[PDB]
Amino acid sequence: MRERLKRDLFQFNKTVEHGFPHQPSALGYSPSLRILAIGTRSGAIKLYGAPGVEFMGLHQENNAVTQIHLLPGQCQLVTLLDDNSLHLWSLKVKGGASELQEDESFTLRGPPGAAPSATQITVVLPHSSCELLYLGTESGNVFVVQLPAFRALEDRTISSDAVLQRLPEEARHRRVFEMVEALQEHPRDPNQILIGYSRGLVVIWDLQGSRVLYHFLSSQQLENIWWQRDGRLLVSCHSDGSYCQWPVSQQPEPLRSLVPYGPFPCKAITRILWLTTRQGLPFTIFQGGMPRASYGDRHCISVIHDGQQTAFDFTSRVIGFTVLTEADPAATFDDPYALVVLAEEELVVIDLQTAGWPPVQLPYLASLHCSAITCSHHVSNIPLKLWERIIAAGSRQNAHFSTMEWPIDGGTSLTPAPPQRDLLLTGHEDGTVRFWDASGVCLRLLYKLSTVRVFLTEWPPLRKVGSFDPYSDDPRLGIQKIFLCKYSGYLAVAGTAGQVLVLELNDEAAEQAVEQVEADLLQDQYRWKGHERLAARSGPVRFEPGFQPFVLVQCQPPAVVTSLALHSEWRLVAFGTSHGFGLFDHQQRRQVFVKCTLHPFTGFVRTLYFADTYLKDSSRHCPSLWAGTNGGTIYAFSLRVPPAERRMDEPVRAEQAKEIQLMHRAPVVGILVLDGHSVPLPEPLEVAHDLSKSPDMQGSHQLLVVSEEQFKVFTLPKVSAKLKLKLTALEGSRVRRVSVAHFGSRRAEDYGEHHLAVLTNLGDIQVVSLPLLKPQVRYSCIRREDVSGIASCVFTKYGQGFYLISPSEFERFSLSTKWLVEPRCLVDS
Ligand SMILES: [Cl-]
């Protein structure tokens, strides 16, 4: 088409990311704005509020973000990188919506000759005045920097020699590096600040008077400090796994000191929080402190409250945590209600209001790799009834969760509700299928299906929370193929050990049995050196509401299922392996036929496609199944399927009508049929739910065969060549994945034409026109070396797509001028 027409239909943009960002390195939180901040090893800063409020930033240096400090009340924040640099970021309104932006940077440095291991920033303390940053260092000196000028103020330096000068000789036995471990402001006096050193000295420093008002020397090495709301109590945690409480009212003694976990040697408690409640029952929240010998490998946050203690246990390293308090600076009690934990592999939120401390569901930042992703499947425009039914069944399996509203709800989303409901399905290594609301900016989990059910498989007070599983339980459970019929609520899933399951959406529970049926693909042939078949449960099994399996087709050999097709109207299931393929009646639960493909691995069945088209006569069109193989062979099978009445009486019959060989012999990656207007045939039950999409039978039908090297069009029923595009011969690329995509014009509202969306082996995304097979546009998208990102890429029926930039995060892009799912929001004072 003309280039003017291309600009109405095609335009490439990467628009938003979905999931949990890879390798987080810092956590921040604004209590005034209720905004969550995540830093990564790559230098990214990601801000999150209410669903639809999102901000992605990137530091010019690719260094890890180690600290994030949102300024109190302000729409600004200060970050710190592992190269010891500070950065002032801002949220500025432009175009009626907020934008994240970096204002300036500053590297604290002493005189030349002074070692860097002395100016290394440990604690960053933004003063409540938002005009100054106090910076504790490894030397033991506290430096001051102006804001928003980012300039050092050497006249306000609080050195270690200046502090130790005001103190008695008993508290002057300093280390070479005093190591500022704590640096905090008085909760009820902006003139007083606390300074804590590694050896154990803590002081309260009069900023204006330049003198020590209070101090003590703890017996154990100091890790951290917490200052009670009223400023009249201090809590210190230490390297031997203990924590002490100190009154603030000269040099006092500890009120109480204890190693909370037995008499065994314990690892350090690295962080502690002491939060009051109006009920007179304080929370004690501390990180670590585990007995070294038998729990040194545990990642724990312990919560103490009202005689109840729980050591929350996470399957990955704690990057940072925060506790949401009801309070603002003026209140008397803290009144916590949520513990937010950023683990290296997931985000966990705990409800602190409800007894038992139940978890809170995530609206975003979901760890898609809780079990490793093994396949993906996107269904666009979901019928609203099935949508609500799947959502409802998801609520039924989430009873253990908290009823609390999502607390990180800051900001306002300027994006209207998604017009159509899009669904993304992910198959996982442990046999689970997760249903995701792929409609807009936030990828929210709606329902989880588990298929392992069809097979036969108190001090310290540890409580395992989170969902990330670092282990590989059983790989043969992994799901390779997914097919959801959005019209019938039927679902087919296929696994790594030849298991094929057909399921149906059920609003209520059931205790039915699952029919085991075998499909021997080597019937006309040999042994099997590999995985033994998954043993199925013989008796009836109870299933909670959702998609419930009623038949299991076990392939013999139990090899990887490499292709899957499901016709809901004809109630048939096609599936292929490296050996052959077969067709299965999921109404009669009986095998229709089986075909071995090891004599035209070139018999690897990679593509399956049902089509009601012209297979033998230009007047008679019958049901048909098409199979494409790695050797360039296309098998076509005529299908005699009875009507609704004789559906169980007489069986479905099938005969091999065609065997088409491609001379260039590239693997068949795509098969489809076009109607008399050169429009692709509609999905099963699509015509039954919309007669306006009835395929043209008056004109001749055409068969489209896409291989890794070429696009070929044949006419039906004769199968003689009419059109061709030799992709690999032209530009040296190979088709890795091809999907039909409807592209809409954005200068003419009621319009659209189908074309082929192509993912090449080089990570490019091309649009090949229908029906003439002319290359339209070529875009750079996935990197050539990113084999995993290419393997995971998946298209939508309307010009969008997803691919993995990491095990736990998708990137969303758009080929179409009709789609641009990007966040737009506003965060005000
Ligand atoms: Cl473009």
PDB file of C-alpha atoms in Angstrom, residues 121-261:
ATOM      1  CA  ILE A 121      27.631   7.905  52.397  1.00  0.00           C
ATOM      2  CA  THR A 122      25.921   5.492  54.808  1.00  0.00           C
ATOM      3  CA  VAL A 123      22.779   7.226  56.136  1.00  0.00           C
ATOM      4  CA  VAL A 124      20.937   9.965  54.243  1.00  0.00           C
ATOM      5  CA  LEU A 125      18.701  12.107  56.468  1.00  0.00           C
ATOM      6  CA  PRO A 126      16.442  14.691  54.797  1.00  0.00           C
ATOM      7  CA  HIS A 127      15.665  17.377  57.348  1.00  0.00           C
ATOM      8  CA  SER A 128      11.994  18.111  58.012  1.00  0.00           C
ATOM      9  CA  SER A 129      12.603  21.603  56.552  1.00  0.00           C
ATOM     10  CA  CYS A 130      13.276  20.120  53.071  1.00  0.00           C
ATOM     11  CA  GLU A 131      16.186  22.589  52.810  1.00  0.00           C
ATOM     12  CA  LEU A 132      19.045  20.338  53.956  1.00  0.00           C
ATOM     13  CA  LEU A 133      20.425  16.820  53.660  1.00  0.00           C
ATOM     14  CA  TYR A 134      22.513  15.478  56.542  1.00  0.00           C
ATOM     15  CA  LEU A 135      24.914  12.792  55.314  1.00  0.00           C
ATOM     16  CA  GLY A 136      26.519  10.228  57.586  1.00  0.00           C
ATOM     17  CA  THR A 137      29.686   8.595  56.285  1.00  0.00           C
ATOM     18  CA  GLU A 138      31.959   5.648  57.032  1.00  0.00           C
ATOM     19  CA  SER A 139      34.554   7.951  58.619  1.00  0.00           C
ATOM     20  CA  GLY A 140      32.097   9.009  61.326  1.00  0.00           C
ATOM     21  CA  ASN A 141      31.588  12.567  60.051  1.00  0.00           C
ATOM     22  CA  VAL A 142      28.207  14.074  59.156  1.00  0.00           C
ATOM     23  CA  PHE A 143      28.118  16.433  56.166  1.00  0.00           C
ATOM     24  CA  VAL A 144      25.378  18.878  55.180  1.00  0.00           C
ATOM     25  CA  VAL A 145      24.174  19.637  51.645  1.00  0.00           C
ATOM     26  CA  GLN A 146      21.768  22.377  50.570  1.00  0.00           C
ATOM     27  CA  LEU A 147      18.529  21.677  48.697  1.00  0.00           C
ATOM     28  CA  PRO A 148      17.605  22.285  45.972  1.00  0.00           C
ATOM     29  CA  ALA A 149      21.061  23.728  45.264  1.00  0.00           C
ATOM     30  CA  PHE A 150      22.980  20.482  45.947  1.00  0.00           C
ATOM     31  CA  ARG A 151      26.044  22.188  47.385  1.00  0.00           C
ATOM     32  CA  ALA A 152      28.111  21.146  50.383  1.00  0.00           C
ATOM     33  CA  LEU A 153      28.155  23.405  53.456  1.00  0.00           C
ATOM     34  CA  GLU A 154      31.486  22.852  55.206  1.00  0.00           C
ATOM     35  CA  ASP A 155      30.599  25.308  57.995  1.00  0.00           C
ATOM     36  CA  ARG A 156      27.861  22.914  59.184  1.00  0.00           C
ATOM     37  CA  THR A 157      29.923  19.703  59.294  1.00  0.00           C
ATOM     38  CA  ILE A 158      29.429  17.624  62.448  1.00  0.00           C
ATOM     39  CA  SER A 159      32.691  15.687  62.678  1.00  0.00           C
ATOM     40  CA  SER A 160      33.521  12.784  64.974  1.00  0.00           C
ATOM     41  CA  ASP A 161      36.314  14.687  66.744  1.00  0.00           C
ATOM     42  CA  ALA A 162      33.850  17.506  67.476  1.00  0.00           C
ATOM     43  CA  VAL A 163      31.322  15.107  69.042  1.00  0.00           C
ATOM     44  CA  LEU A 164      33.873  13.094  71.058  1.00  0.00           C
ATOM     45  CA  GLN A 165      35.263  16.406  72.358  1.00  0.00           C
ATOM     46  CA  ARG A 166      32.069  17.196  74.310  1.00  0.00           C
ATOM     47  CA  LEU A 167      32.056  13.742  75.965  1.00  0.00           C
ATOM     48  CA  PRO A 168      33.978  12.173  78.871  1.00  0.00           C
ATOM     49  CA  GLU A 169      37.126  10.134  78.258  1.00  0.00           C
ATOM     50  CA  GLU A 170      35.228   6.871  78.853  1.00  0.00           C
ATOM     51  CA  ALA A 171      33.341   7.440  75.576  1.00  0.00           C
ATOM     52  CA  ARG A 172      36.263   8.532  73.369  1.00  0.00           C
ATOM     53  CA  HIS A 173      37.811   5.148  72.422  1.00  0.00           C
ATOM     54  CA  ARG A 174      37.091   5.734  68.747  1.00  0.00           C
ATOM     55  CA  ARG A 175      37.719   3.519  65.748  1.00  0.00           C
ATOM     56  CA  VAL A 176      39.622   4.731  62.700  1.00  0.00           C
ATOM     57  CA  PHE A 177      36.265   4.653  60.888  1.00  0.00           C
ATOM     58  CA  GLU A 178      33.529   5.526  63.380  1.00  0.00           C
ATOM     59  CA  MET A 179      30.981   4.361  60.765  1.00  0.00           C
ATOM     60  CA  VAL A 180      27.780   6.394  61.129  1.00  0.00           C
ATOM     61  CA  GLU A 181      25.121   3.697  61.467  1.00  0.00           C
ATOM     62  CA  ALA A 182      22.195   5.915  62.503  1.00  0.00           C
ATOM     63  CA  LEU A 183      21.365   9.546  61.751  1.00  0.00           C
ATOM     64  CA  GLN A 184      17.860  10.721  62.639  1.00  0.00           C
ATOM     65  CA  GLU A 185      15.907  13.846  63.566  1.00  0.00           C
ATOM     66  CA  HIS A 186      14.139  14.445  66.860  1.00  0.00           C
ATOM     67  CA  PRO A 187      10.461  13.611  66.187  1.00  0.00           C
ATOM     68  CA  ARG A 188       9.355  16.705  68.157  1.00  0.00           C
ATOM     69  CA  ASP A 189      12.311  19.097  67.707  1.00  0.00           C
ATOM     70  CA  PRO A 190      13.917  20.046  64.355  1.00  0.00           C
ATOM     71  CA  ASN A 191      16.962  21.369  66.271  1.00  0.00           C
ATOM     72  CA  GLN A 192      18.000  17.974  67.695  1.00  0.00           C
ATOM     73  CA  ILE A 193      19.462  15.130  65.640  1.00  0.00           C
ATOM     74  CA  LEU A 194      20.660  11.687  66.695  1.00  0.00           C
ATOM     75  CA  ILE A 195      23.999  10.244  65.580  1.00  0.00           C
ATOM     76  CA  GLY A 196      24.876   6.581  66.108  1.00  0.00           C
ATOM     77  CA  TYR A 197      28.272   4.990  65.519  1.00  0.00           C
ATOM     78  CA  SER A 198      29.262   1.386  64.894  1.00  0.00           C
ATOM     79  CA  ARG A 199      31.195   0.932  68.152  1.00  0.00           C
ATOM     80  CA  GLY A 200      28.033   1.716  70.111  1.00  0.00           C
ATOM     81  CA  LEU A 201      28.149   5.425  70.902  1.00  0.00           C
ATOM     82  CA  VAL A 202      24.846   7.249  70.396  1.00  0.00           C
ATOM     83  CA  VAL A 203      24.453  11.011  70.892  1.00  0.00           C
ATOM     84  CA  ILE A 204      21.702  13.618  70.605  1.00  0.00           C
ATOM     85  CA  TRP A 205      23.218  16.742  69.075  1.00  0.00           C
ATOM     86  CA  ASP A 206      22.050  20.351  69.473  1.00  0.00           C
ATOM     87  CA  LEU A 207      22.424  21.653  65.918  1.00  0.00           C
ATOM     88  CA  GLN A 208      22.350  25.375  66.729  1.00  0.00           C
ATOM     89  CA  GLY A 209      24.318  25.147  69.981  1.00  0.00           C
ATOM     90  CA  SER A 210      26.878  22.673  68.570  1.00  0.00           C
ATOM     91  CA  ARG A 211      26.894  20.540  71.711  1.00  0.00           C
ATOM     92  CA  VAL A 212      25.906  17.076  72.907  1.00  0.00           C
ATOM     93  CA  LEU A 213      22.722  16.995  74.999  1.00  0.00           C
ATOM     94  CA  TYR A 214      22.504  13.239  75.634  1.00  0.00           C
ATOM     95  CA  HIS A 215      24.524  10.103  74.984  1.00  0.00           C
ATOM     96  CA  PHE A 216      25.166   6.477  75.869  1.00  0.00           C
ATOM     97  CA  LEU A 217      27.645   3.736  74.969  1.00  0.00           C
ATOM     98  CA  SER A 218      25.945   0.423  74.208  1.00  0.00           C
ATOM     99  CA  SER A 219      27.821  -2.781  75.016  1.00  0.00           C
ATOM    100  CA  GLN A 220      27.242  -4.469  71.639  1.00  0.00           C
ATOM    101  CA  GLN A 221      28.082  -3.143  68.186  1.00  0.00           C
ATOM    102  CA  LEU A 222      25.333  -0.879  66.841  1.00  0.00           C
ATOM    103  CA  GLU A 223      23.285  -1.736  63.737  1.00  0.00           C
ATOM    104  CA  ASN A 224      20.331   0.681  63.777  1.00  0.00           C
ATOM    105  CA  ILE A 225      18.131   2.944  65.899  1.00  0.00           C
ATOM    106  CA  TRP A 226      14.445   3.828  66.139  1.00  0.00           C
ATOM    107  CA  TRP A 227      13.132   6.999  67.791  1.00  0.00           C
ATOM    108  CA  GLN A 228       9.687   6.797  69.393  1.00  0.00           C
ATOM    109  CA  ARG A 229       7.062   9.328  68.293  1.00  0.00           C
ATOM    110  CA  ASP A 230       7.232  11.468  71.436  1.00  0.00           C
ATOM    111  CA  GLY A 231      11.044  11.338  71.352  1.00  0.00           C
ATOM    112  CA  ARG A 232      11.138   9.964  74.906  1.00  0.00           C
ATOM    113  CA  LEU A 233      12.275   6.422  74.046  1.00  0.00           C
ATOM    114  CA  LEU A 234      15.019   4.973  71.851  1.00  0.00           C
ATOM    115  CA  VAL A 235      15.350   1.410  70.557  1.00  0.00           C
ATOM    116  CA  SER A 236      18.732   0.150  69.346  1.00  0.00           C
ATOM    117  CA  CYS A 237      19.460  -3.126  67.557  1.00  0.00           C
ATOM    118  CA  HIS A 238      22.865  -4.746  67.526  1.00  0.00           C
ATOM    119  CA  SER A 239      25.232  -7.128  65.758  1.00  0.00           C
ATOM    120  CA  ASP A 240      24.827 -10.022  68.222  1.00  0.00           C
ATOM    121  CA  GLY A 241      21.094 -10.220  67.487  1.00  0.00           C
ATOM    122  CA  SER A 242      19.831  -8.144  70.430  1.00  0.00           C
ATOM    123  CA  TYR A 243      17.862  -4.943  70.862  1.00  0.00           C
ATOM    124  CA  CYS A 244      17.789  -2.502  73.781  1.00  0.00           C
ATOM    125  CA  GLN A 245      15.422   0.266  74.869  1.00  0.00           C
ATOM    126  CA  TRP A 246      16.721   3.601  76.156  1.00  0.00           C
ATOM    127  CA  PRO A 247      14.867   6.493  77.807  1.00  0.00           C
ATOM    128  CA  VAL A 248      15.344  10.076  76.629  1.00  0.00           C
ATOM    129  CA  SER A 249      14.951  12.486  79.559  1.00  0.00           C
ATOM    130  CA  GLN A 250      22.749  12.683  81.089  1.00  0.00           C
ATOM    131  CA  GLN A 251      23.887   9.148  80.216  1.00  0.00           C
ATOM    132  CA  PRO A 252      21.048   6.681  80.937  1.00  0.00           C
ATOM    133  CA  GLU A 253      21.060   2.879  81.126  1.00  0.00           C
ATOM    134  CA  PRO A 254      19.071   0.437  78.956  1.00  0.00           C
ATOM    135  CA  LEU A 255      15.553  -0.216  80.226  1.00  0.00           C
ATOM    136  CA  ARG A 256      15.621  -3.733  78.762  1.00  0.00           C
ATOM    137  CA  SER A 257      17.922  -5.742  76.502  1.00  0.00           C
ATOM    138  CA  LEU A 258      17.353  -9.162  74.977  1.00  0.00           C
ATOM    139  CA  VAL A 259      18.316 -11.526  72.178  1.00  0.00           C
ATOM    140  CA  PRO A 260      14.767 -12.435  71.079  1.00  0.00           C
ATOM    141  CA  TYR A 261      15.695 -15.852  69.603  1.00  0.00           C
TER     142      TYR A 261
END
